[PDB]
Amino acid sequence: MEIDELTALGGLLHDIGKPVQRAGLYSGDHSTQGARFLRDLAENTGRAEYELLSLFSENDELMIRRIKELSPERFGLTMEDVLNALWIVYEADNLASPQASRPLYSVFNPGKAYPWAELDFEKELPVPGDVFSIRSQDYRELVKRLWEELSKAKLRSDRLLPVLEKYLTFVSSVTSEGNIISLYDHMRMTSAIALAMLRAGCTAEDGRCRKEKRFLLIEGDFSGIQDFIYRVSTLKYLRARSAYLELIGWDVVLEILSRLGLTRANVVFNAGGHFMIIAQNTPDAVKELEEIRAKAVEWLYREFESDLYLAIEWEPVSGREFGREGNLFAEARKRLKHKLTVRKLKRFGEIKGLFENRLVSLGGNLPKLLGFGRTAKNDAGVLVEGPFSGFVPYLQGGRPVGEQILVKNTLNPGEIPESAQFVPYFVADYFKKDPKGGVATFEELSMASTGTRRLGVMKGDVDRLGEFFSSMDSPSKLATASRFMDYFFKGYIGAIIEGKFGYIIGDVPSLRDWPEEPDIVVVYAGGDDFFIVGAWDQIFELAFRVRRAFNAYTGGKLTLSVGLGYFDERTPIYRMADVVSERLDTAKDEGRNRVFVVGRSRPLDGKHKLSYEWNHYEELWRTYAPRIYAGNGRLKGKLESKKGLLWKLLEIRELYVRDPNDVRWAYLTAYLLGLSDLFPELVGIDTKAVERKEPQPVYWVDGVLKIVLMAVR
C-alpha cells in the first residue's frame, strides 16, 4: 500500500457501516458496525489491507494502539501517516455532506422517494414515488451481494467504485426525511475531497484545510460541439463524430486524473462535453493543468482548425465553500462559469501561432466491440488518437491493450488484466441495424415511415437545467443530480425506444403500432442535449414517450423542450439540424415545457405561439385523432371518401390566420360539414378564449390534422 491509494479507499468506505447497521448484523452504531464488517471481510479471502481500512468507520489513545496493533511496515506506510489518513478522511465526510428504514428521497422531487432496487438500465425505470419503509431483510440480502463482490474486487479505487455504485446507489446516505444524496455519491465525493487534501500536503489540522483555499474546482467545456458533429462535407459518419468527441473528452479527463495522482471518484460528472474535477491547490497542480490545457488546445487546432475548442478554467476554493453558510458552493461554481464564458470568448488564445477512413472504420466495426484501450499514440492497431494517447478498439475475442481500458455500458470489469485501470462509460447508442450488419441510413429510416416517406429529426433539451444544478448545496448533492440526470439519457433512452415502461408512459400520440425493432437512430444523447433521427412517425411518437418517461423519471418537477422536423430523405444534415435547432429554441422562447410539432401558419399579433404545451398537444391528439384516424396508416372508414374535408378545415383555419378577430370562420365550418357531429369544438366562438385573450380552438387543429394527413398518403 501507499498513503495515496489508502486515503482514497479510506474516504470510499468511511460510511460502508450504514448498510450493515440497518440490516442489523453486528448491533453497534454504524461507526463500530462498519469496522467489524471490513475486519470480518479482511479475515475472509485473507486480504490484510481491509483490516487496515476498517479503522475509517471509527483523545486518540486507543486509535494509535489499534494502528500500532496493525503492522504499518507490512504495507509500506508510517503510523504518523495513517493518523493523517484518518483525520483527512474524517474532515472530508463533513465537507462532502432518522430511522433505519427511510428510503432515498429523489433529488428531482424530495417529496417522492425510490423503491429499494439496484441500478440496472435493462430492468426498470426508476420513478420517484410513494415512501416505502425499507425492510432490514432487504439490507441483509444487499450486504450479502456487497460482501461477495468486495470478496473478488481487486482493491484498487477503479474496481471498488463499480460495486459501491451497483449496490449502494439507491440508498439514503442519511435516513432523515427529504434526504436527496445517494450513498455511493457521498462515498465518492469524500474519496475525492479526502485525496484532494492529501495531495494538497496539509495534515494534523483539527481548520487549515477548511478555511484556507487548498482545493481546485476544475471545469472543462467543449465549444463548437455541433459545428464539429453536424456541418459535414451521412449518418454512419455523424455518430462516428459523436463517439470520437466522447474519447477526446476522457483522454483529457483521464490525463488530468493520471498527472495529478487523483482517481475517477474526483470526476464529479463528465457528459454532454462538460466535465468537473475536484483536486489540490498545489503550485505543481496549476503548472500541470496549464500544460494539459495548452497541449490539448493545440492538438485540437492542428486536427480540426477552430471548429472544436476546449475551455478549461479552474478556481481555487476553501473547504467552507464546499457547502452552506449564512450558499457558497453554487456561488463558487458561478465564478468558474464566468471564467469559462471569458475563455470561450478567447478561442485558441492559447495558440500565439494563430494571428500570423479511421472514423469510416469507427462506423463499420461499431457493432462487435466492448470498449477501447488507452495506450501510447505510436502503438499497433491504434484506430484513432486524442490529444494525449492512442485508442485501440477492444473486441469480444480480443485482448485489452493499455494503461486504462474504457469499457462501454457495464460496471462489470469482465475479462481484462488485473493491472488495467477500469474506466466504465455509458452512451445511448440505439440504432436500427440494416439487413447488412451496418447501422441504418437516412433513406432506410425514411422508408419505414407510415404514409409520406420523410425522415423525422428531433432535437431536445432539459429546461433550466443550469438553474437546477446551481440549486445543489453540496458536492454530494451535485454528484447525485448530475449522475441521475445523465443516467436517464445514457441508460434509459435506449430502453424507451425499445418500448419498455409502456405502463409508466401509457397513451401517447402515435400513428402505427410500436415496432419490435424501431426505425430510430440516436445521434448524440447524454446530459440535457439529445438529437435523434428515424422514420418521421416513429420520431413523432418517440418525442412524447421520452417526455412522459422523463416526467415519471423526475418528480414531474423538470420539463423538456423538443423541436421536431420531417424532411426529404435526401436533405443535407446541417440544414435539418439547423431547422429543428431553430424550432427547439422557439419551444424554449414561448415559455418552456413545450414541443414544436410541425410547421404552422399563424397570425403575427404576438398572441399565437407555434409550439404546444405538451399536455395541451397530448389533450388535443386524444380529442381529435380517434375521430378521423383509424390507425396503422389508414383513415376512419367514415372519412375514407370524405378526406377532402380535412383540407377544407385547414383551408377554413387559414381564413382565421388572416384575421383572428373576424368571426366568419364559425359561419363557414357549420356549412362545410353540414356529418355535423364531427368537430363540434370548432363550429362555435369560444368566449373563454376572448376573455383570456387566448387563440380560438381552430388555431390548434393543424398540429393534429397535418400529421394525420402525412400518415394517410
Partner 1 sequence: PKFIAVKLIPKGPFRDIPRADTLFGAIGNAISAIHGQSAVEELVDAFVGGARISSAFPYSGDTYYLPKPLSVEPALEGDEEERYTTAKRLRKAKYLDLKNFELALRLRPFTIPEEIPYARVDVPRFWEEIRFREKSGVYFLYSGPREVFDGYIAPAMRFLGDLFEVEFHEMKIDAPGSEYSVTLSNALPTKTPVLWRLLRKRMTFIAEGSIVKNDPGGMERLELEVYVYGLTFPLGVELPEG
Site for Ni ion in 7-36 (CB under 5 A): 15
Shortest gap between Cβ of 8 and partner 1 (angstroms)?
Answer: 36
Out of 338, 368, 433, 648, name the contact with partner 1 by CB under 8 A.
Answer: 338
Residue 345 makes contact with partner 1 by CB under 8 A = yes
Distance from C-alpha of 369 to C-alpha of 372, rounded to nearest angstrom: 8
Tell me if 287 contacts partner 1 by CB under 8 A: no
Residue 342 or 685 having the CB closest to partner 1: 342
When asked if residue 693 is in the footprint of partner 1 (CB under 8 A), the reply is no
Q: Output the nine-digit C-alpha cell for 222.
A: 467543449
Contact between 457 and 577 (Cβ < 8 Å): yes
Nearest Cα to Cα of residue 166 among 226, 127, 121? 121
Please, what's the largest Cα pairwise distance for the chain?
A: 97
Q: How far is Cα of residue 558 from the mean position of the Cα atoms in its chain?
A: 14
For partner 1, the closer CB: 466 or 626: 466
Contact between 285 and 220 under an 8 Å Cβ cutoff? The reply is no
Report, in Å, the least distance between residue 355 CB and partner 1.
5
10 Å Cβ neighbour count for 462? 22
**Given candidates 26, 237, 348, 514, which one binds partner 1 under the rule CB under 8 A?**
348
Residue 337 near residue 329 (C-beta atoms within 8 A): no
Report residue 452 as a C-alpha cell.
409520406
Contact region with partner 1 (CB under 8 A), list: 343-351, 359-367, 595-603, 700-708: 343-351
Asked whether position 346 contacts partner 1 by CB under 8 A, the answer is yes
The correct pick among 64, 117, 294, 354 for binding partner 1 (CB under 8 A) is 354
Total Cβ atoms within 10 A of residue 381: 13
Kindly write out the interface string for residues 580-609 of this chain, putting x where it contacts partner 1 by CB under 8 A and - elsewhere.
-----x---x--------------------
462-501 residues near partner 1, rule: CB under 8 A: 464, 466-467
With respect to partner 1, which residue has the nearer C-beta, 604 or 675? 604
Cell of residue 409, nine digits: 455500458
Q: Helices in 47-78 by DSSP H: which ranges? A: 50-53, 61-69
Residue 107 to residue 180: CA distance in whole angstroms: 5
SS3 content of the chain, % helix, strand, coil (to 5): 45, 15, 40
Cβ-based nearer residue to partner 1, 179 or 471: 471
If one asks whether residue 294 binds partner 1 (CB under 8 A), the answer comes out as: no
* Secondary structure element (H or E) that encloses residue 233, with its range: none
Q: Give the residue from 58, 60, 86 showing the smallest Cα distance to 72.
A: 86
Q: Residue 31 CB, nearest distance to Ni ion (Å)?
A: 6
CB of 585 to partner 1, least distance (A): 8
| Total residues binding Ni ion (CB under 5 A) | 1
Which residues face 314 on adjacent strands? 218
Asked if 399 interacts with partner 1 (CB under 8 A), we say: no
Residue 261 vs 323, nearer CB to Ni ion: 323
Cβ 344 to partner 1, closest distance in Å? 9
Does 342 bind partner 1 (CB under 8 A)? Our answer is yes
CA angle 682, 683, 685 (to 5 degrees): 85
* Least CB distance to Ni ion at residue 377 (A): 45
Of 26 and 348, the one with the shorter C-beta distance to partner 1 is 348
Nearer to Ni ion, 15 or 537 (CB): 15
By CB under 8 A, the count of residues binding partner 1 is: 22
Helices marked H in 200-309 — which ranges?
208-211, 225-229, 235-260, 283-304
Q: Judging by beta carbons within 10 Å of its beta carbon (0-12, 13-18, 19+), is residue 210 exposed, middle or buried? A: middle
Smallest separation (angstroms) from Ni ion to the CB of 21 = 10
For residues 580 and 458, the answer to whether their CB atoms sit within 8 Å is yes
The CB-of-250 to partner 1 minimum distance in angstroms stands at 26
503 contact choice in Ni ion, partner 1, none (CB below 5 to 8 Å, kind-dependent):
none
Task: Pick what 137 binds: partner 1, Ni ion, none; C-beta below 5 to 8 Å, kind-dependent.
Answer: none
Cβ closer to Ni ion: 171 or 405? Answer: 171
Q: What does the alpha-carbon distance between residue 595 and residue 558 come to, in Å, rounded to a whole number?
A: 14
Q: Whole-number minimum distance, CB 574 to partner 1, in Å?
A: 10
Q: Please report whether residue 355 would count as binding partner 1 according to CB under 8 A.
A: yes
Establish if 306 lies at the interface with partner 1 (CB under 8 A). yes
Residue among 2, 60, 291, 568 that touches partner 1 (CB under 8 A)? 568
Strand order in the sheet with 267-271: 267-271, 274-280, 215-223, 309-317
| CB closer to Ni ion out of 15 and 529 | 15
Is the Cβ–Cβ distance between 649 and 642 less than 8 Å?
A: no
Q: Between vectors from CA 104 to CA 102 and to CA 109, what angle results, nearest 5°?
A: 120
Among 156, 159, 347, 627, binds partner 1 (CB under 8 A): 347
The reply to whether 433 sits near partner 1 by the rule CB under 8 A is no
| Residues 697 and 689 sit within 8 Å (Cβ to Cβ) | yes
User: From CA 337, how far away is CA 608, in angstroms rounded?
Assistant: 36
**Min CB(338)–partner 1 separation in Å:** 7
Binding site for Ni ion (CB under 5 A): 15
Binding site for partner 1 (CB under 8 A): 305-307, 338, 341-342, 345-349, 352, 354-355, 464, 466-467, 568, 571, 575, 585, 589
